[PDB]
Amino acid sequence: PSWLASALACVLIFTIVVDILGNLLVILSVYRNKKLRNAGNIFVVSLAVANLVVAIYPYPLVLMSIFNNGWNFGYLHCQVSAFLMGLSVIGSIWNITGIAIDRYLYICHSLKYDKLYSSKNSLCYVLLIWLLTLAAVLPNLRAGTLQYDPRIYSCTFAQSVSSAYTIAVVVFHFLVPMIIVIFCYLRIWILVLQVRGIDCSFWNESYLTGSRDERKKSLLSKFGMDEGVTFMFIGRFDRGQKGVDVLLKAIEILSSKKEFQEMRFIIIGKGDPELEGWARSLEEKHGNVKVITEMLSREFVRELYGSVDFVIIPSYFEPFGLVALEAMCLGAIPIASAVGGLRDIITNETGILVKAGDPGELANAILKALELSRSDLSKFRENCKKRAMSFSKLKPQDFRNFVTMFVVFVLFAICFAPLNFIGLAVASDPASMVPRIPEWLFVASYYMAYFNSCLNPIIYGLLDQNFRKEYRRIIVSLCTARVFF
Numbered sequence: 001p002s003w004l005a006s007a008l009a010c011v012l013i014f015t016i017v018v019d020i021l022g023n024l025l026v027i028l029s030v031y032r033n034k035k036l037r038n039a040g041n042i043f044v045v046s047l048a049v050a051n052l053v054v055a056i057y058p059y060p061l062v063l064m065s066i067f068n069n070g071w072n073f074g075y076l077h078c079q080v081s082a083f084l085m086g087l088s089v090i091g092s093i094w095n096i097t098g099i100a101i102d103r104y105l106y107i108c109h110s111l112k113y114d115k116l117y118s119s120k121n122s123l124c125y126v127l128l129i130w131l132l133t134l135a136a137v138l139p140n141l142r143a144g145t146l147q148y149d150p151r152i153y154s155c156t157f158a159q160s161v162s163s164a165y166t167i168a169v170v171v172f173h174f175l176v177p178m179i180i181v182i183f184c185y186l187r188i189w190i191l192v193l194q195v196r197g198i199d200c201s202f203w204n205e206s207y208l209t210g211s212r213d214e215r216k217k218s219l220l221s222k223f224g225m226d227e228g229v230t231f232m233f234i235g236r237f238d239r240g241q242k243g244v245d246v247l248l249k250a251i252e253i254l255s256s257k258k259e260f261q262e263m264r265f266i267i268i269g270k271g272d273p274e275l276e277g278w279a280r281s282l283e284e285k286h287g288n289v290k291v292i293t294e295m296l297s298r299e300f301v302r303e304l305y306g307s308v309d310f311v312i313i314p315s316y317f318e319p320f321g322l323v324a325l326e327a328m329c330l331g332a333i334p335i336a337s338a339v340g341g342l343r344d345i346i347t348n349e350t351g352i353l354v355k356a357g358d359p360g361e362l363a364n365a366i367l368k369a370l371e372l373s374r375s376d377l378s379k380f381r382e383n384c385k386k387r388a389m390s391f392s393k394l395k396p397q398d399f400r401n402f403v404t405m406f407v408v409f410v411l412f413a414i415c416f417a418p419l420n421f422i423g424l425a426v427a428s429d430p431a432s433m434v435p436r437i438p439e440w441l442f443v444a445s446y447y448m449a450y451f452n453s454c455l456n457p458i459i460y461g462l463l464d465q466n467f468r469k470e471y472r473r474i475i476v477s478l479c480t481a482r483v484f485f
């Protein structure tokens with residue numbers, strides 16, 4: 001391990017150099033560029049400062065202590081260096097949490113409003129984060145959980161001092177931010193796919209001829225049934241995916257009610273033959289229920305969306321649910337299950353939301369849909385059309401910034417995943433897990449987390465076009481001089 005000592009010194013030498021130069025460039029680039037001068041990027045400046053703190057005083061002492069093979073400085077120099085390392089690591093994960101919340105609210109704001117998301121309170125949330133990070137690192141001085149570790153030649157937070165302090169540090173300052181951020185970028189990725197998936201040039205009301213009342217009367221006549229509140233279902237027949245079984249059980253509940261005579265049902269799909277029989281059974285017993293097992297054209301489905309009054313989406317698990325959004329394009333008021341994706345698309349103003357897997361509540365939701373006059377429906381169709389219109393509005397946008405900030409988080413998660421995992425293993429039995437954990441695994445977990453501090457500016461340049469432009473802009477301005485001929 002003689003060479004392993006010099007190699008460890010190189011990793012830090014690289015980190016210190018790239019951090020000091022790189023994160024200083026990030027601070028300048030945001031102030032210099034008008035494109036990067038937005039309020040939502042105050043967190044980026046705050047995260048870069050957190051990265052700079054460790055390369056100025058803690059890391060340099062750790063670098064000497066590799067060569068010295070011990071702590072040749074005081075106890076205050078150990079307690080303070082461990083403290084600034086805390087504010088940095090804890091500050092970095094909460095700043096990344098801030099950006100993840102900021103960017104999720106940004107897509108939601110651009111959907112509901114024509115004006116861009118201002119990020120007006122960005123400076124206040126940064127100060128709140130630093131008051132939170134200080135409140136978590138500060139009690140480690142009095143408890144005495146900060147001490148030198150010879151293996152990693154540094155003064156850090158010892159995971160073997162108090163297991164209660166480590167479990168709280170792993171849950172509240174790693175597992176808690178991780179969940180918040182993974183959920184945020186999950187909801188962003190769905191909304192970007194919904195923007196991608198919609199086609200306002202195909203699913204357009206223009207393609208339809210006469211009035212909705214005339215087109216509904218025409219569609220119902222061809223199916224052999226008179227005028228009424230027409231409901232539609234479209235999707236494969238399955239016991240626990242698209243929930244055709246929930247709809248079928250609900251029609252039976254409604255068949256006895258005097259309100260059923262004023263209803264019309266057009267079920268479309270194919271799957272489980274038992275469900276296919278159940279549907280055809282009600283088609284016989286009731287003349288207001290029509291089943292289509294055949295595959296209908298995208299052109300005809302578009303005409304159906306434009307003619308029917310409602311579209312029932314009783315799906316158990318629907319992640320995107322473009323069908324709900326496609327129906328809204330042609331004024332079909334959706335009645336859908338409160339599932340992830342459908343919860344995003346359907347507003348309380350646009351459609352009716354119901355609990356997934358309940359035929360009772362769906363029957364009452366279909367009843368609520370029936371207890372609505374021609375005047376009430378016309379505004380609901382308008383809102384449905386306006387909501388689908390806002391999704392296509394975001395199509396020309398450059399979603400490249402969301403990828404960079406996601407890569408920033410992804411890399412942070414890789415660097416600190418072993419350190420927080422070892423911290424849980426050590427928390428089980430501190431006396432037993434000290435030799436049970438391999439030395440290479442302990443050293444690698446710590447130095448990965450150290451290298452992370454210089455990673456963020458390298459990522460900004462290789463992915464964000466505006467950052468790469470301003471890096472060369474500042475570099476050339478200080479290299480080249482001014483002279484007169």
Ligand SMILES: COc1ccc2cccc(CCNC(C)=O)c2c1
Binds near residue numbers: 087136419
């Ligand atoms: C919890 O507070 C601190 C205070 C100082 C630190 C200094 C260096 C590194 C860490 C993270 C090590 N925590 C885990 C759970 O692995 C610190 C954490």
